[PDB]
């Protein structure tokens, strides 16, 4: 309490700072504006003079510079924190309830949020960038109108680190679920092994045939499955869990899995159980399974069962049964409570130390692509799909750009604004023609969907109505075109407008919580236009360049600033003194005034005699 008020009041005076006397003979006696940067008074009880924080800012902005040495080496503690945070990743958050400085994120009131910090380890820049880009593209395309064509458009309309991603895809042998799905959609060759349950399944012995079986679940729900009959030998490959599995006709006989931690081993074991197509787990199904992705589209029953088991499997472990175990070198058991045991283990699931690892394969196959990106090989088994794509997201060692129409809402609201205006400026000719001819379709363009999110819901229909009326006036008046205004104001009209009487002098866009304001007339921090250089700046980030179209009024009048009114340029003292925007509601048709639009400039305006209508 006391310190805050004391500092607030102390900073008020002109010279609240105390500094050594040397500053007298090192910095100018005042500023370029003649402001004094010090005072001759000496601190009580010492020889230090009194100066002002303006001197602090002067030193910060144009003070003498020195070499930055001993700083990176001395601060060895917080730098590692920065590296771990930035190079770390994240994951799905579950509402149920290295790791010594992230406590708030990992644990909360009643939810858990996974996080794996970084450091300087792991794979290279190109592979990680490709994996993350493919993950984002696939995840967004999951919810598109048609994932296949949309995904192709995103892949062909994006690049990685200044290099088109198609070249990397064709010249990079990196393997990943998202990358493999993108390659399959592109029609190239993908790995024979099929990514299921988050791990790569590679067959290396045995075979089976597909049969359609109807099975009654433990919850009294009948599901149709494509059960495989015949001995098969699979290897589950994963970074933190590698396993070797045998399967037979509706029977699991052996599974040896090695993982760094118990969680990965448990995940691999659950994946093996679900892949085994055992009747016992069918009888162990509880509840109604309707798992869907962000697109709410129903998935195949196997994926739903896998998700249900991943949610929890405590009620299933004890149902398998009890069998004996033999003590062997490099052999570990699996208790029902998920704990290794020397004397006992869970049925048909063992744990080894080294496991099956090391050598990989370089085999590729020709595959076909179905409606919703579900990659299926010639045999019939599902190879890949977005349902099996991991949720991990990290950082990009090199800049990655996404010019598509649905990747904009990734870099942030500022990025959304900048990219919407970039799209508007890049398509200036076509957008102008559409606005002139059939603007109704333009106002329904999906490319403006992100902007509708930034504009508050409570004040988006009224904003849209104001914009529609203003643009109708601009169209029906003629002779007063102004491209900058059109680009600035177009995106706000997307909503289904409604009639209103407000005369908006500024519209609000929510960026990073704080709401910025863009003025209908003149320049705004959100939208700046420099006519001296003819450049548009959006929040300090360039958005493109504007070229004046074959319509313009270079002699005053501007009809798209005040609804129902036409501004006639410079003010005239002869007419009625400066009015108020609210008062303008009483002027008669054709009346003129000297309204004060804003800032410190007066503009003469005449009330439109006609009336511009909208749908």
């Amino acid at each position: 309490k006391n310190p805050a008020l004391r500092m607030k009041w102390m900073m008020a005076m002109k010279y609240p700072i105390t500094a050594d006397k040397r500053i007298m003979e090192m910095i100018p006696e005042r500023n370029e504006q003649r402001q004094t940067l010090w005072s001759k008074t000496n601190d009580a009880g010492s020889d230090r003079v009194m100066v002002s924080p303006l001197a602090v800012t002067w030193w910060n902005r144009n003070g003498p510079t020195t070499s930055t040495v001993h700083y990176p080496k001395v601060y060895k503690t917080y730098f590692e924190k920065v590296e771990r945070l930035k190079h770390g990743t994240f994951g799905p958050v579950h509402f149920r309830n290295v790791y010594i400085e992230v406590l708030h994120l990992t644990q909360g009131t009643c939810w858990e949020q996974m996080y794996t910090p970084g450091g300087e380890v792991r794979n290279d820049d190109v592979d990680q960038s490709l994996i993350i880009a493919a993950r984002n593209i696939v995840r967004r395309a999951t919810v598109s109108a048609d994932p296949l064509a949309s995904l192709l458009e995103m892949c062909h309309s994006t690049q990685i680190g200044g290099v088109r991603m198609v070249d990397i895809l064709r010249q990079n042998p990196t393997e990943e679920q998202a990358v493999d799905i993108c390659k399959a959609a592109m029609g190239l060759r993908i790995s024979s092994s099929f990514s299921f349950g988050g791990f790569t399944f590679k067959r290396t012995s045995g075979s089976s045939v597909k049969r359609e079986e109807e099975v009654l679940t433990g919850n009294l729900q009948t599901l149709k499955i494509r059960v495989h009959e015949g001995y098969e030998e699979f290897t589950m490959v994963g970074r933190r869990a590698t396993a070797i599995l045998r399967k037979a006709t509706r029977r699991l006989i052996q599974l040896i899995v090695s993982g760094k931690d118990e969680q990965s081993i448990a995940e691999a074991i659950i994946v093996a159980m679900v892949f085994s197509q055992e009747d016992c787990m069918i009888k162990a199904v509880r509840g109604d399974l309707n798992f869907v992705n962000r697109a709410n589209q129903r998935l195949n029953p196997m994926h739903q069962l896998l998700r249900h088991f991943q949610k929890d499997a405590k009620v299933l472990f004890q149902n398998w049964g009890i069998e004996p175990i033999d003590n062997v070198m490099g052999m570990i058991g699996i208790l029902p409570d998920m704990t290794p045991s020397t004397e006992m283990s869970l049925r048909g699931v063992r744990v080894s130390k080294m496991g099956v690892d090391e050598y990989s394969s370089t085999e590729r196959v020709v595959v076909s692509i179905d409606r919703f990106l579900r990659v299926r090989d010639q045999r019939g088994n599902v190879l890949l799909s977005p349902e099996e794509v991991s949720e991990t997201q990290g950082t990009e060692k090199l800049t990655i750009t996404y010019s598509s129409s649905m990747m904009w809402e990734i870099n942030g609201p500022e990025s959304v604004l900048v990219n919407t205006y970039q799209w508007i400026i890049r398509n200036w000719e076509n957008v102008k023609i559409q606005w002139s001819q059939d603007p109704t379709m333009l106002y329904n363009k999906m490319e403006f969907e992100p902007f509708q999110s930034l504009v508050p819901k409570a004040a988006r229909g009224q904003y849209s109505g104001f914009v529609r009326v203003l643009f109708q006036q601009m169209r029906d008046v003629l002779g007063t075109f102004d491209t900058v205004q059109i680009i600035k104001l177009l995106p706000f009209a997307a909503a289904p407008p409604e009639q209103s009487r407000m005369q908006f002098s500024s519209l609000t866009v929510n960026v990073r919580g704080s709401g910025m304001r863009i003025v209908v007339r003149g320049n705004s921090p959100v939208f700046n236009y420099n006519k001296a250089t003819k450049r548009l700046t959006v929040l300090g980030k360039d958005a493109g360049a504007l070229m004046e179209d074959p319509d313009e009024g270079t002699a005053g009048v501007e009809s798209a600033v005040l609804r129902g009114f036409l501004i006639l340029g410079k003010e005239n003292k002869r007419y009625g003194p400066a009015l108020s925007i609210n008062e303008l509601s009483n002027l008669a048709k054709g009346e003129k005034a000297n309204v004060l639009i804003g800032q410190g400039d007066v503009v003469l305006v005449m009330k439109r005699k006609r009336d511009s209508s909208i749908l």
Partner: protein, 707 residues
Amino acid sequence: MEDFVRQCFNPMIVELAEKAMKEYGEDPKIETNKFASICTHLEVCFMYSDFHFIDERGESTIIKHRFEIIEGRDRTMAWTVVNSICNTTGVEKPKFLPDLYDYKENRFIEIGVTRREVHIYYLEKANKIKSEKTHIHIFSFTGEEMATKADYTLDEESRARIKTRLFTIRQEMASRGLWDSFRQSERGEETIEERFEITGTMRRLADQSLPPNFSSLENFRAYVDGFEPNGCIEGKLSQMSKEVNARIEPFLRTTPRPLRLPDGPPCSQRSKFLLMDALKLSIEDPSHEGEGIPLYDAIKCMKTFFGWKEPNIIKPHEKGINPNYLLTWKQVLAELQDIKNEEKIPRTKNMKKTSQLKWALGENMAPEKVDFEDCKDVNDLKQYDSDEPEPRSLACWIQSEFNKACELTDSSWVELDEIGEDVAPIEHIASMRRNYFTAEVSHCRATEYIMKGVYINTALLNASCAAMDDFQLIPMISKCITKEGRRKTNLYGFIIKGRSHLRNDTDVVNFVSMEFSLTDPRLEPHKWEKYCVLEIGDMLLRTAVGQVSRPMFLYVRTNGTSKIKMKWGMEMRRCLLQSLQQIESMIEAESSVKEKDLTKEFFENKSETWPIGESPKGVEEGSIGKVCRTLLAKSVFNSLYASPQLEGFSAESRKLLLIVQALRDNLEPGTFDLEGLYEAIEECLINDPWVLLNASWFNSFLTHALR
């Protein structure tokens, strides 16, 4: 010296050492050698318990950690871990806190490092601690190592590594030229016999501090030392009175009754400013010369009105000075005109001392100071009137006050700065919740009240602490942003503070506040008892039959505020945080049962109905928006009406709510003393209107839920 330890030792070990010494309350700056000693001890313990694991068969494998650290944690965690280990393995409970625990050997090991010879340290440690089945690991910087029974759990490689670490550390101290101090600081902690004798006064006091039937402390010590329980509790309970018992009253649905409300004259407004009846003289967009200064803004806002009349009193202050309020209002207007006549107007203008100003403030009505010796012989000299205020009946105007406080305004009252981007999904959920709530409540009247109070209180405090002996004038300004997006500046009235020579935080400054309004105070005069009402103009308002003229009233009232109350009113922004916390807690409570982030369907769904009111046809629901606005309004009302009565009633009624809840879930509840709880709750319903309305809400909820 500590710089070397900080730079060499890894951050985690130094952080653990800092926490450990903070637990014992020892400052590292004063004690330097012990800092290095503790850091080395922790380092050697961790190395002893590093890169060691136990395989699933039982054999020792080097890559379930073989060694578990017990001294690397705090006392509570270490004690819990050792208790659990002993209970599970049935091992003899250690006397002290061991440094490490070996799982393969299932035994507790202690680590010791000394500057002097190892043998003396081992001997003293064994004599002090070792009594049965205990092992100590002893090392030193001299390169000589030994342990108990010549048994080392660590292999040759680990022992050599620890020896090399100690040797390189010793070489570092030798190079730095401070190893001599390190060695000399060690002395073995000579444990000379400690004597603490109670004698003289303390012996008498101790002898006079024993239970009955005891003559001296020594007799009691001997008695307790030889004490062994034998059925004393059972005997006392058998001989205890049967009437003593905590009986459970069967709590059914019919038992509860509504709280008995007090009877008497209706309540009255006591807020620092009007809430439902405030009036604003506003400028849509301040672009005039000299912006930012509250005085110029107030002058400009005043110039927008031309309906001034000759002031006259409609509803007078019954127990107060009516004419002087009028005189001081006239003085305010004349002083403003005089300021208008000036050219070089300073930042603020102090009103000249006048009779009416002093009388309205209360300076001339303030009792003087004199010692009790010179005023004892006074016929009516009594203790301050610490008498319980008279009961006041519930009045409907507070209900309307809250109703209008919960309505939706048409301006952006609160402006908040920016933060970083959100990358984690939990960050996305948090941003979504915050943005939804903010969009909901940013247009509520509660935010208007918050900003008005903050501005008034900050200006008043700055004026009070700026000029001590000046009766300054302070406009009541509030800056907002309309829906259209124009910076509106509203002026509600004026305040004049008294003398502000403040030395204590609780010192009371007296001010006189004049507030505009358009409510006729002859409709509910009882609501207005502390105010003097003047009619200082007429306003033209547009209605379906043109511009009708209605009177413009002014409420003048003398109030007092303390610096701590000023800060409390300057920190009302926390009402938004509290209201969020409430809605977020409800979100989490409803989500946990369903086990999924439910904010998306909580806010956007617009299919939920939370009972938030009542109507003639029955109860009424609303939206999550209505819920958020109601909670924020309740928080602001609680902040403005801060009184012990409110907290008392809330605390005593929360228990009744909980018991009713338990009744709803068929938990078969019971009450030991229901009437006592009822009396405790009703003790807080005497005169306050806010608490009375809360009690009325509680009675409505009681009569509705049990149906």
